[PDB]
């Protein structure tokens, strides 16, 4: 079964780095594109960039700054190291597959299956 | 007509070279109003056949 599980959420200090995971099973990365979206509390979900299987990173060029995206292939799983993480910083992200090969639905989001996501908080204490 | 009886010089007379069409000033799509799009996902992502 296809699932998606991220891990590596929680208190994190202004100003730190921060480093998430994305541990896939079901599937592996050698031919799917994955992407990172978060999820304020108050605004909708905001994409955050997207792994290639070749390899190729892109970004949110409001974003690019601080977010980082690599892969372990032989643990096919994903990784977002985050640096300097700020008040609005604080989101629940989400690690998505893209349904580049179909479309059965008009999906907004462009993605068929969701990761259960992480909370991230970024405050004093 | 010289095009039509292939020759640069035509004779004296009438000759019928083509038909005039009166030639189509717009373009006209009727299908019915349904606007609900047809659920091909329930047959192709099912979960059993
Ligand atoms: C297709 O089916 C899978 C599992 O049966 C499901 O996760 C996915 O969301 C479905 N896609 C659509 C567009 O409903």
């Known amino acids: ?125 | 007509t010289k095009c039509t009886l292939k020759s640069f010089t035509v004779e004296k007379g009438i000759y019928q070279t083509s038909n005039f069409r009166v030639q189509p000033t717009e373009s006209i799509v009727r299908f019915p109003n349904i606007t609900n799009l047809c659920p091909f996902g329930e047959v192709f992502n099912a979960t059993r056949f």
């Open chain 1, 1 to 125: 079964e296809v699932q998606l599980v991220e891990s590596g959420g929680g208190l994190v200090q202004p100003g730190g780095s921060l480093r998430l995971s994305c541990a896939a099973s079901g599937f592996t990365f050698d031919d799917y594109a994955m992407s990172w979206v978060r999820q304020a509390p108050g605004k909708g979900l905001e994409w955050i960039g997207r792994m290639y299987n070749n390899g190729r990173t892109s970004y949110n060029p409001s974003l690019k700054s601080l977010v980082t995206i690599s892969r372990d292939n032989s643990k096919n799983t994903l990784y977002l190291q985050m640096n300097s993480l700020r008040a609005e910083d604080t989101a629940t992200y989400y690690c998505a597959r893209d349904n580049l090969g179909y479309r059965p639905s008009e999906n907004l989001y462009g993605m068929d299956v969701w990761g259960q996501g992480t909370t991230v908080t970024v405050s004093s204490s």
